[PDB]
Amino acid sequence: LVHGGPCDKTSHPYQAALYTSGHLLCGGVLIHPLWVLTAAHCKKPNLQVFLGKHNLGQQESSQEQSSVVRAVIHPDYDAASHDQDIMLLRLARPAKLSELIQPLPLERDCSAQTTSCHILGWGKTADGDFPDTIQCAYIHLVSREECEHAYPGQITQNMLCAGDEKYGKDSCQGDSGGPLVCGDHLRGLVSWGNIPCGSKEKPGVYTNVCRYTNWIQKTIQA
Ligand SMILES: CC[C@H](NC(=O)[C@H]1CN(c2ccc(C(=N)N)cc2)C(=O)O1)c1cccc2ccccc12
């Protein structure tokens, strides 16, 4: 993510890091002791999930590593447009919850009022580097009308736009599937946006999690 800074160490207990081949692939969000949400475009074989991490270069006493034993991409995901860019990952065992490992409640209300949000991740920064320490930035949800204006004809009801007019804080490569948190609820997932990253003119685009309540429930209860 670009134009942010290191997160407070205790402020992100729901953040997951998704690895394959020993390297960071995506972010993710713990939503249940057995389940992490990420972007559909993150699907690959041999996925490992790290919970409780802050610095990727350290073996942290709070961390837990787990294999993904089932990956359930949304059946209607459209790779070209990123429509329905959501996937549920079932962990090999219930997450060992702690002060630093906690699920984040979902925003189920698609009419929810709160537009002050934040994003987090270990993706690319404004200098091009990939940080060991998780980065955070405050950004704002934009109205559906302003979102449609930024990407004419390319915004569906399954997408939200958010960004920052002052500094252009924005998510980036490596942050996919990370949470857009608004009013301390999960509102969206990092999906797509401008390259180079930066939201001063075109906002980042996020999967609208409130549209997936029923699919999430059916998947978890199957
Ligand atoms: C799963 C592969 C991974 N895909 C992505 O990160 C996606 C997400 N995204 C992207 C671009 C701009 C914004 C924005 N809000 N402005 C948000 C997301 C993008 O372009 O692709 C990836 C792509 C390229 C380099 C990487 C390096 C390390 C780890 C993952 C990398």
Author numbering: 16 to 36, 38 to 67, 69 to 125, 127 to 130, 132 to 147, 150 to 205, 210 to 222, 222A, ...
Sentences copied from the publication:
KLK6, associated with neurological diseases like MS, Alzheimer's,5 and Parkinson's,6 and with the migration and invasion, and thereby metastasis, of tumor cells, has also recently been linked to the zoster (chickenpox) virus.
The ethyl group nicely fills the S1′ pocket and the naphthyl group extends into the S2′ pocket. Furthermore, we solved crystal structures of both inhibitors bound to KLK6, revealing their binding mode.
